[PDB]
Amino acid sequence: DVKMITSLSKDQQIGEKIFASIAPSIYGHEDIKRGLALALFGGEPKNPGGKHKVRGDINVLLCGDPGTAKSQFLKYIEKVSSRAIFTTGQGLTAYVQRHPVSREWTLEAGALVLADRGVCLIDEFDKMNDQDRTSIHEAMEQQSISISKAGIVTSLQARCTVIAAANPIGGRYDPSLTFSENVDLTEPIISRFDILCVVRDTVDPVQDEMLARFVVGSHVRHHPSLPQEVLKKYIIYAKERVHPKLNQMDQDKVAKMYSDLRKESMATGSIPITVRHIESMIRMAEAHARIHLRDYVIEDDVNMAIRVMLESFIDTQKFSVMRSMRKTFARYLSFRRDNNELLLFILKQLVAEQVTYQRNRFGAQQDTIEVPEKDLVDKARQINIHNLSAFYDSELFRMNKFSHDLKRKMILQQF
Amino acid sequence: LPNVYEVISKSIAPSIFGGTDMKKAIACLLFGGSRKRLPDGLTRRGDINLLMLGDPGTAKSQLLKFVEKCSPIGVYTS
Amino acid sequence: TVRQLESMIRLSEAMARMHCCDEVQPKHVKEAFRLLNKSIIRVETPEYCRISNLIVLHLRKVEEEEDESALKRSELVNWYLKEIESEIDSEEELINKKRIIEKVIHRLTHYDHVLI
DNA sequence: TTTTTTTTTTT
Numbered sequence: 001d002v003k004m005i006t007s008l009s010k011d012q013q014i015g016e017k018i019f020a021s022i023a024p025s026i027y028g029h030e031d032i033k034r035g036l037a038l039a040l041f042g043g044e045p046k047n048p049g050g051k052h053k054v055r056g057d058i059n060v061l062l063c064g065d066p067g068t069a070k071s072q073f074l075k076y077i078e079k080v081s082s083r084a085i086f087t088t089g090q091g092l093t094a095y096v097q098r099h100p101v102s103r104e105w106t107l108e109a110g111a112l113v114l115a116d117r118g119v120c121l122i123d124e125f126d127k128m129n130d131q132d133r134t135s136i137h138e139a140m141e142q143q144s145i146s147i148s149k150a151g152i153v154t155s156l157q158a159r160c161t162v163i164a165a166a167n168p169i170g171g172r173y174d175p176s177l178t179f180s181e182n183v184d185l186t187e188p189i190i191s192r193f194d195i196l197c198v199v200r201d202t203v204d205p206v207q208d209e210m211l212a213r214f215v216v217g218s219h220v221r222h223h224p225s226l227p228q229e230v231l232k233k234y235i236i237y238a239k240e241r242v243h244p245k246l247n248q249m250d251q252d253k254v255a256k257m258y259s260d261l262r263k264e265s266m267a268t269g270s271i272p273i274t275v276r277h278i279e280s281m282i283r284m285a286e287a288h289a290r291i292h293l294r295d296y297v298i299e300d301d302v303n304m305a306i307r308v309m310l311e312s313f314i315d316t317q318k319f320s321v322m323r324s325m326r327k328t329f330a331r332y333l334s335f336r337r338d339n340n341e342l343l344l345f346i347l348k349q350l351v352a353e354q355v356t357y358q359r360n361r362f363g364a365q366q367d368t369i370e371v372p373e374k375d376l377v378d379k380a381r382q383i384n385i386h387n388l389s390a391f392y393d394s395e396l397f398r399m400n401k402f403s404h405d406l407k408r409k410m411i412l413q414q415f
Numbered sequence: 416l417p418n419v420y421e422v423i424s425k426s427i428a429p430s431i432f433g434g435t436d437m438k439k440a441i442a443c444l445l446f447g448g449s450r451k452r453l454p455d456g457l458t459r460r461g462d463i464n465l466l467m468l469g470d471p472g473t474a475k476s477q478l479l480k481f482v483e484k485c486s487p488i489g490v491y492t493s
Numbered sequence: 494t495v496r497q498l499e500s501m502i503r504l505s506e507a508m509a510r511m512h513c514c515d516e517v518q519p520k521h522v523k524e525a526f527r528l529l530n531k532s533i534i535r536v537e538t539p540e541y542c543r544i545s546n547l548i549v550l551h552l553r554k555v556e557e558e559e560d561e562s563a564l565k566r567s568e569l570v571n572w573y574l575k576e577i578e579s580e581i582d583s584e585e586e587l588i589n590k591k592r593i594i595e596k597v598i599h600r601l602t603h604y605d606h607v608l609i
Numbered sequence: 610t611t612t613t614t615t616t617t618t619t620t
């Protein structure tokens with residue numbers, strides 16, 4: 001049963017192969033796919049020897065304008081996971097109830113004690129009530145509830161990972177303010193979440209076809225005229241037969257970043273990475289011990305842990321700070337990413353802004369946008385790659401419906 | 416012992432360092448003055464109050480947690 | 494948004510049912526699109542001309558400063574007279590444009606968009 | 610000792 005899993009984990013490249021196995025339908029969002037995959041298997045719930053009770057649960061909080069498949073991300077995790085439950089925010093704790101059959105006034109379980117080891121899927125987080133809000137926070141940093149109700153005084157257990165999605169105020173997330181404004185949530189609550197993914201939207205021509213075609217086709221094959229087998233048995237197996245260890249070679253590899261970034265953030269209107277972010281990073285350290293069976297901390301997945309713990313912090317920032325901190329760190333951290341995506345980041349904007357120009361004077365939603373070449377390498381000089389032909393050959397940009405011409409220099413955009 | 420003052424105010428905030436005055440004062444609140452009743456029954460206070468103004472930089476939450484933990488009776492509220 | 498798309502195939506299917514057919518054709522989708530097109534109306538205001546020249550300049554002012562130093566305040570004002578006054582010709586319209594440009598460029602101040 | 614509907618005092 002494991003004899004396959006041995007080499008399948010020893011592929012050394014199971015990351016990409018597993019990321020695109022969750023979120024089976026919904027296109028895009030290989031960013032948030034990463035975070036949610038980190039959350040699913042979890043981390044390591046180590047017991048600190050100083051009686052401090054650090055927790056081993058990853059809690060996520062989506063957010064973004066309506067119509068971006070948040071609820072589907074909740075519903076699919078209902079299925080793939082195990083012993084999961086679900087709720088809306090528009091029953092969270094055990095309550096006295098008159099039994100249907102026995103006709104005695106017993107106590108019934110709520111909705112945070114039915115995930116005592118699995119996951120708790122909260123929906124419509126904003127619509128929670130004041131009692132619900134004062135009751136949800138207690139279980140985050142204590143993971144234990146007391147019930148001195150009409151029934152009897154008890155103290156039960158609740159060890160669940162929370163997966164919720166809020167909404168943007170004003171019907172749209174606007175990134176001029178900080179994320180702590182468009183979320184409409186009490187401030188010491190957002191600290192109780194490890195990841196803060198921000199879903200957003202933009203009118204982008206080349207993705208309109210990509211999303212349309214997908215939906216239309218999903219309406220063609222549903223009416224009366226890594227697959228779902230490897231990863232379920234894999235979340236069953238890899239949950240059990242690993243116990244990640246912790247050496248002390250990474251203990252100083254991070255502080256060199258903190259000492260810099262704390263100043264970098266405090267310099268402007270923001271609060272830098274604080275200890276409740278280092279805890280999340282060190283929790284997501286082991287989040288890959290479950291995928292690789294690695295279980296040994298290495299300077300490799302620390303490049304991943306720091307990368308993620310800043311990924312979930314640069315987005316929740318101000319207008320020009322979300323880009324100033326990027327110009328510093330996204331180039332500083334030496335992102336262990338594609339050399340090609342950084343190529344697209346340029347000409348995507350250089351064609352989108354040109355369309356925005358050619359609309360505010362003409363107005364015609366023109367067919368074939370035209371952009372000469374010279375502009376691209378001008379900005380490529382900043383990242384120092386200057387590679388176009390090896391990218392021209394790469395089919396990682398044909399899908400984005402572009403072109404190039406050697407004698408015309410035109411990056412012709414069709415759609 | 417002669418230097419009885421600083422020996423406490425040194426071991427009441429190990430993690431956070433800097434400006435022991437903000438730790439000097441906290442030493443007194445743990446002891447407090449004494450409750451007097453004048454002939455008129457017009458009692459007097461027996462406790463003190465402290466304000467730590469400044470930006471929330473999480474350097475103070477540690478101190479709150481400490482003073483709550485090391486207190487005969489104590490509650491930390493949001 | 495997206496939900497308008499999942500609501501265009503529905504109208505086409507409901508149009509096809511009507512003609513007792515068993516498949517969707519372009520003849521149906523064209524009409525199911527015309528209907529959903531007349532449904533949404535354009536918001537109005539007592540002003541579209543005065544917003545063309547709000548972002549025709551801040552597309553002539555963002556890319557122009559992130560690479561070089563900045564632009565002359567007495568020259569970016571004329572650039573608009575140096576791009577779109579090159580085709581339409583009436584010797585009166587020059588100062589009649591300059592006055593409205595000065596007023597709007599004093600206006601850009603209170604939105605906190607174009608400051609000097 | 611539970612819902613649901615309707616009136617009036619209270620934070």
Ligand SMILES: Nc1ncnc2c1ncn2[C@@H]1O[C@H](COP(=O)(O)OP(=O)(O)O)[C@@H](O)[C@H]1O
Binds near residue numbers: 071072211
């Ligand atoms: N990228 C996408 N891929 C597939 N379906 C999508 C996508 N974006 C939106 N949808 C559709 O939108 C619906 C999700 O809406 P939802 O996020 O629940 O709205 P709200 O957040 O307001 O509750 C899904 O049923 C799905 O059909």
